[PDB]
Amino acid sequence: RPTFYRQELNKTIWEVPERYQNLSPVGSGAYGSVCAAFDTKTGLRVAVKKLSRPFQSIIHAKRTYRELRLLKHMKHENVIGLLDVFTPARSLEEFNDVYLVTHLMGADLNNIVLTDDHVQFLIYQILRGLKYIHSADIIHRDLKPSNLAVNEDCELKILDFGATRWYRAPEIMLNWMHYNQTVDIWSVGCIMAELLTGRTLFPGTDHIDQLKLILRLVGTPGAELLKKISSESARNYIQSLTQMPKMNFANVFIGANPLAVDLLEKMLVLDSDKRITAAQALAHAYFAQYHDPDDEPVADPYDQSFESRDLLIDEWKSLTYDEVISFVPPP
Ligand SMILES: Cn1nc(C(C)(C)C)cc1NC(=O)Nc1ccc(Cl)cc1
Numbered sequence: 056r057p058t059f060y061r062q063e064l065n066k067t068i069w070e071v072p073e074r075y076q077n078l079s080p081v082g083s084g085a086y087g088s089v090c091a092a093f094d095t096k097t098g099l100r101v102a103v104k105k106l107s108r109p110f111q112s113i114i115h116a117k118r119t120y121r122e123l124r125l126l127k128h129m130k131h132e133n134v135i136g137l138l139d140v141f142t143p144a145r146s147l148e149e150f151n152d153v154y155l156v157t158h159l160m161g162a163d164l165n166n167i168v169l170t171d172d173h174v175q176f177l178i179y180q181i182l183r184g185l186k187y188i189h190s191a192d193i194i195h196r197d198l199k200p201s202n203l204a205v206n207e208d209c210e211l212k213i214l215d216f217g218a219t220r221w222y223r224a225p226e227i228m229l230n231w232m233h234y235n236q237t238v239d240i241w242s243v244g245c246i247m248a249e250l251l252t253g254r255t256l257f258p259g260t261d262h263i264d265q266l267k268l269i270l271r272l273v274g275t276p277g278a279e280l281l282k283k284i285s286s287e288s289a290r291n292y293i294q295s296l297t298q299m300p301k302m303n304f305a306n307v308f309i310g311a312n313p314l315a316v317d318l319l320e321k322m323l324v325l326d327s328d329k330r331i332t333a334a335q336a337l338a339h340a341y342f343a344q345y346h347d348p349d350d351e352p353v354a355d356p357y358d359q360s361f362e363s364r365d366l367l368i369d370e371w372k373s374l375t376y377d378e379v380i381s382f383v384p385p386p
Contacts, residue, residue: 059143064090067105070143071154075103086118086217091159094138100159101138109153109375116371119153120361123378126155128191128357130385133184135204135214140382147376160212164203169250171312173209178247179345180211185243185333188213189236190353198222198242200249220265221255222246226327228266229289237330244322251311267296273325274301280326314341 057072078090144150224241259265321331
């Protein structure tokens with residue numbers, strides 16, 4: 056066991072292994088605070104996150120176990136990955152705090168403020184990462200600029216901290232609960248549009264306004280789409296709106312790469328059943344300058360059967376403690 060060392064960075068107190076030097080608060084979340092740090096064992100600049108209330112309840116505990124399982128499984132250039140995970144506790148009895156460590160990226164996809172070149176490189180990496188995580192039956196469902204880490208080299212990694220509705224696919228707005236992975240593709244679509252344009256494509260004020268703005272572009276749902284909506288509530292809402300026609304994307308996005316406007320068409324389709332997938336998008340002619348089907352790997356199988364489990368805090372804690380102890384760092 057390494058020798059830890061304590062210190063206080065504002066309201067939050069930290070106790071980490073000597074290996075990590077010069078901690079600097081970088082921001083807070085409802086799930087923990089993060090500190091940029093120097094890992095002397097690797098010379099790398101890293102980010103260290105201390106989970107707020109690891110096991111405050113059944114939900115916090117389960118979430119904590121989830122946070123750990125996901126990050127330990129992610130091993131892709133365009134996805135956040137675990138460098139190290141540690142705890143001050145020498146036993147499960149004293150186990151109350153979790154610290155995750157990862158590569159320090161710097162700025163978010165928002166900060167960066169884009170030449171058609173960066174746009175196709177940027178979105179290309181998102182899709183490359185999305186293909187990977189999607190291949191493990193994992194849906195992000197919360198994709199947006201702030202959850203996209205980009206370095207000065209324009210390298211991108213998808214991640215999940217913790218607006219949002221501005222990027223949510225319509226079938227997750229209406230409160231539907233049988234949505235596929237392509238909800239993420241819709242977010243990509245919204246993000247891509249924001250880069251080529253410089254404006255958030257759908258700046259809605261609520262779940263209703265947001266849905267209106269969307270339809271204002273993609274148009275009202277036709278016979279085939281209304282036909283698949285279970286919720287009489289939702290169905291009656293949509294049908295009760297002044298019919299809206301689909302717009303010509305070539306017009307909406309004035310003078311943008313024509314190949315880029317075509318991909319936007321395929322990503323912002325209202326019916327999740329006909330929306331392009333991450334894998335299929337990596338092959339769109341728009342990414343011909345970067346696509347390489349030999350370097351767009353899928354993930355190893357991911358066991359998420361725990362997601363349907365209902366356990367006590369100590370069990371979710373025990374499972375999490377095992378996970379921290381069995382961790383094996385990357386090369
Ligand atoms: C909840 N979740 N989901 C994913 C994906 C789907 C991107 C693998 C990743 C995460 N979790 C995280 O991204 N967690 C995390 C940990 C440390 C820092 Cl500094 C920032 C973020």
